[PDB]
Symmetry: C4
Subunit: 357 residues, 4 copies
């Protein structure tokens, strides 16, 4: 007989219960850990995609307290240049009081690599990258493990993030290999078709919960990657036990993301595509699609709304910080009817909301 391990849930399946609160949303602390050795002042990371993060997106993310990960869909020299532009970037000191900087007062930056790309790692390291993100469609693989070990052997002090995974067994394997963080997410991405093309995946809330419980045994932070639609999803992911959240679609339509604006039927858009899509890979068998997202202005405006939502959540739960948030957190499972009730219902929206579209 078939082995059904569990009934897995995603963000829309659950809600946080309110708790007794003595703290205001403006008073709570949202600092967190990116890796074992790197801290963030905000728990947000921009995705390593060629329609989301290059040097300017990464600069703004670090300035606001988070991090940007330069994508790997470019030559080594180009990625080095993007990394250097971020490091050399730094009026600003209290225009951006929460800026995420290294020991030398330079903005933090991450960069993506693939399996066996040791040459790329060497160049990124000497370029002064703060963290390397070893990403694959399947992080629980021999190629990924071998690469982790090779990098750690050559650069023992280089912070290394590995992914993506969706099981406790995968988290254990990566942690035992010595990673400094694991990235969780198989299939939940907005532009991802992995679950449909391959039939493989785990609903993100359950994936995070399972991997966090295992990763916690090693003191290794979990990055929740993909599937974030609203600010409330950020809160849920962190409450479940994730230390940080990686975002693609919500940042693709900003000023700072690569690509240009274009008008379509009197509306402005930006291109957003999976890194496993045909376009990005250029017969291939794609695990992503090429699409469009509405233009939403600046990264700072988006981030402000996202963090505002997170602060509101911690206020409802009564949490003074993220660790406290995770300790207090209690969930209820809801139905489709509950989800319908949660959204705007039976009223025709006439004005655009900053955090609800």
């Amino acid at each position: 007989a078939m082995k059904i391990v569990k009934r897995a849930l995603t963000f829309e399946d659950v809600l946080l219960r309110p708790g007794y609160s003595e703290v205001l949303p403006k008073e709570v602390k949202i600092h967190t850990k990116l890796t074992k050795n790197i801290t963030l002042n905000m728990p947000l990371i921009s995705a390593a995609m060629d329609t989301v993060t290059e040097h300017r997106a990464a600069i703004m993310m670090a300035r606001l307290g988070g991090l940007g990960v330069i994508h790997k869909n470019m030559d080594i020299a180009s990625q080095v240049r993007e990394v250097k532009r971020v490091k050399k970037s730094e009026k600003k000191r209290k225009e951006y009081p929460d800026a995420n900087k290294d020991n030398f007062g330079r903005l933090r930056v991450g960069a993506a690599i693939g399996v066996g790309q040791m040459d790329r790692v060497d160049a990124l390291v000497e370029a002064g990258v703060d963290v390397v993100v070893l990403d694959s469609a399947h992080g629980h693989s021999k190629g990924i493990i071998d690469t982790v070990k090779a990098i750690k052997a050559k650069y023992p002090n280089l912070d290394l993030i590995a992914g993506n995974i969706a099981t406790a067994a995968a988290a254990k394997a990566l942690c035992e290999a010595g990673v400094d963080a694991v990235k969780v997410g198989i299939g939940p991405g907005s532009i991802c078709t992995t679950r449909i093309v391959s039939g493989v995946g785990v609903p993100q809330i359950s994936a995070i919960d399972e991997c966090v419980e295992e990763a916690n045994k090693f003191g290794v932070p979990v990055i929740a990657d993909g599937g974030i639609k609203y600010s409330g999803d950020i809160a849920k992911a962190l409450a479940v036990g994730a230390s940080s959240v990686m975002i693609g679609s919500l940042l693709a339509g900003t000023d700072e993301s690569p690509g240009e604006l274009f008008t379509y039927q009197g509306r402005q858009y930006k291109s957003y595509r999976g890194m496993g899509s045909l376009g990005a890979m250029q017969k291939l068998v794609p695990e992503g699609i090429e699409g469009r997202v509405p233009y939403v202005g600046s990264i700072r405006s988006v981030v402000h709304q996202l963090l505002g939502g997170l602060r509101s959540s911690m206020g409802y739960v009564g949490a003074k910080d993220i660790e406290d948030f995770q300790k207090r957190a209690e969930f209820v499972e809801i139905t489709t009817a509950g989800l319908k009730e949660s959204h705007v219902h039976d009223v025709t929206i006439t004005h655009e909301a900053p955090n609800y579209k």
Copy 2:
């Protein structure tokens, strides 16, 4: 691992079972308690919103046996004036035989306040307000509790409603602080985006059930606030154990609600917006949206249909009054298919129904 406390249900998830009946809908009694000391002749309350309740809406609600709560999105002098207009309001004596009046034959009225607004409380009291509604997005908070205690210390005999809450622990805290009623509803409002923005909330049926069980220990009435779409939702909320129901959207498009009619594509509408929306609050992080509702005529016509539905329900269950209704009530949980079956299906509606839109 994540702590999922329960699988929570809302109105669409459940239905009342019919019981043996010896009573006709026209014969049942629908009087109830607003607070420990204030009775209603009808279990309906209009929401404290600037697109729902000012003096004229409040006057009609009290005349029909219920109550209106003057919103707090105005200066103290203005709210005092609105309260006074209702109190001085009182052909009518059996044009409106079920009118909700105080000891002096004056129409009952409520008024909303916020945390720390003691000056506003003083003025409303001397204006002769019958009940003060201390509402917050998060009633289970230090600010709310402290305000309850401060008001009770200065005005021991002033009826006080506090909210909003969604847990038994919250109900306990408010009741122990000495409130005369608790208002239940975190997220179910038609214009509410709290559950989406913050990820926090509890499906309304389960929220009511949980808070009622706790509040009953103190002899404190529960007000079911938000998420009411049809008259059947009123019946469900009361049957579960709520003593009264607060309504926003279903009353926003009436003659008596603030704001003017406007035509759009040959149809008339009225503005309806969350009190946490950008417009009502006027970067902010909104927990509500600004929208529109169809014009539906008079408050009396709407109320008649709502109460008609409630009377029908009690007739089906065989209840002579609300208390009996709550004792007899038995529910079944249904599926999405059951909900589809419950609504109008496989038939194209050609004539508008008074209670089904």
Copy 3:
């Protein structure tokens, strides 16, 4: 705490499992019992509605082996005339070899009455009606029980159907009062809004199952009334334990139903409305709506497709007749995904199907 008795299912929630079969659909027997004393050659009954059944619809239903119930939205003299037209109706003898006739070779006919309408009963009886259908929105009531007893006391041999009900307790009460059949269905009707207006109802599959188990103790047949969308629903209702099925919407758009054809956007329709709708009742509080259904030709063509579906079902299960069908029947509960899979999916229909619209 709220008392949730069960998780109730309707037709879309379940499917019949195939069994070993030695019988062909053309060979199975579909005769059944209407009441304790009246047999049908087909298990179909047309609804007692003024847009479904008058004398000509009733005549065709009886000719095809089933029954029609003349509605009560007319004066006593008019209903008597309709009943007489059916009785006096009887080339036909093997144009319609399965005709449902009484001892005198006259077509069987039913007629609807309400609570306390003894005058109407007297006239229908002397008009030679075969069965009286005492219907109410709430069959589990004192008014219905008292009427059953009064009719049985005056006409001991008059077959009496009473409804509508949805619980075992209701079935017990009616059976103990001496009814010859119970009609099950609170809310599932296509034009019904009872569950939405009053919040009261039970999903039809569970309602049938519960009432059948109780009614079987008295040897009393159960009529499944309302919610039938496809021929497969007929099979499910009968398999669960119902002895017959009452249909409204699927017969409203036929030649024989009352009302005239009308064209709308190049398409022909017929009026179909709830008997609790404003129009049919002519401030009232309606429990039904007024609508339209596509014109579908003759009653015989519709019935042929419905019975064809039932025959196919019994063939799949391997049942030689209805009683055998009910004994063999095994169900699986499905998900929304299963229901989607069951319908036509991922293919654009280009030709109209006789039994699938």
Copy 4:
């Protein structure tokens, strides 16, 4: 009371969990068994439908390593001719290195028959057909069993596939009759209305799982027939325990399928209809509909994408071949929210994907 045997699942209800992998998608082996005696190099079979498989579709399927089944909606002489064209068909030898051939280097081919069609069997055998597919709407029947026994008695070495079934009891009966494979699928077909017309069927994932467990006791392969929408469904069906998959809709819009291209609103389509539809059968009671599918180019291009998806899946699970795949396979049950998350969400697709439409 009604007997609900189980809560049955289909493809959309489940997802595969990723496992530790040391194999690349390009390295995995996808050979499998069609019957006890016939092997496939690819696990795909084209459906026996007059809008899917005749000689040219069958030729391409065998060339790519799978099989085509010539439909039976034609005279015996015509089906013989189609079979002969495939057998006589065989630059190609490593244009198509994975071709599915018999002992004589001729392309494998199947042909459909019905109950009692012994004359047709005789002619197909002497025409050199490799396998006969005895299909019925109800494989668990006396007619099918008797036909299996008659064929085996006359042609002991003729590979025989029988279907369709959906229960373990049905699988047992066919296997004990001596079939070489069972075909599973009652109702899941894209053009199928059986579950709606008759109320009979079993969600395909549970159907496969149940029949595989029984068929495995006899060493008899299970063919998963119908309901395949995406390549991920192929992976799920095989992972559950099916040895091969039969496909209709995904192959109907190819060059090689019977019927001609036609333009509609600037788009090209091909006809696709159920073999139980009115058109294919030409009052009848249809269990299928007549429709259209988009033109998708060549069979080879479609197959490449389907197999690419399967290879990706086995890579995620870490399976070196199909048997290993079935041993490693672990599933999670998901919700509607999880399914929504799995598909493309919150992004407007602007470019057509080869494997996602």
